[PDB]
Amino acid sequence: CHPCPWEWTFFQGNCYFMSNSQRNWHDSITACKEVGAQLVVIKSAEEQNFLQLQSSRSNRFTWMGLSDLNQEGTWQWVDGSPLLPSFKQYWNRGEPNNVGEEDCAEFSGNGWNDDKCNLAKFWICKKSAASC
Numbered sequence: 183c184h185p186c187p188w189e190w191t192f193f194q195g196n197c198y199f200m201s202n203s204q205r206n207w208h209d210s211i212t213a214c215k216e217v218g219a220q221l222v223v224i225k226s227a228e229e230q231n232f233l234q235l236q237s238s239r240s241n242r243f244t245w246m247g248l249s250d251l252n253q254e255g256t257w258q259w260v261d262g263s264p265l266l267p268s269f270k271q272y273w274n275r276g277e278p279n280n281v282g283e284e285d286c287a288e289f290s291g292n293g294w295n296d297d298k299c300n301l302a303k304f305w306i307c308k309k310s311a312a313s314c
């Protein structure tokens with residue numbers, strides 16, 4: 183028994199995969215579903231710091247499963263849960279600014295940025311680990 187599939191990173195009972203290719207946000211959602219996973223939805227501050235650190239070290243602009251597509255300015259996770267007030271701190275300075283209509287959230291440097299949903303970026307999938 184091993185808790186995660188090969189090349190997946192285990193963290194606090196879940197498995198994480200960072201892509202080595204780039205897609206737009208809607209295709210990133212599909213990419214994760216095809217491996218029985220979900221474009222990463224963040225549930226805790228520890229998990230946030232864990233993901234941002236890898237995004238900073240790798241220096242890769244990376245999609246997360248969050249958008250304000252349904253209502254501009256109200257951010258929602260792809261599993262339907264709302265962005266909580268205790269997560270607003272992770273936006274980068276001056277963000278979210280929706281310049282040129284940016285509806286999808288990404289890891290950018292030390293925090294989050296809203297960027298155009300049609301741009302190709304790396305992504306991270308999340309699924310729960312098996313019990314060994």
Ligand SMILES: CO[C@H]1O[C@H](CO)[C@@H](O)[C@H](O)[C@@H]1n1cc(-c2cccnc2)nn1
Nearest residue numbers: 276277279280281284290295296297298
């Ligand atoms: C790399 O990050 C910058 O580019 C991202 C991609 O466009 C943005 O998503 C980020 O917000 C941020 N940004 C853009 C502007 C801006 C551009 C033109 C005129 N006025 C403001 N400000 N900050």
Ligand SMILES: [Ca+2]
Nearest residue numbers: 250254283285
């Ligand atoms: Ca919009």
Ligand SMILES: [Ca+2]
Nearest residue numbers: 250280284285
């Ligand atoms: Ca927006």
Ligand SMILES: [Ca+2]
Nearest residue numbers: 279280295296
């Ligand atoms: Ca922005």
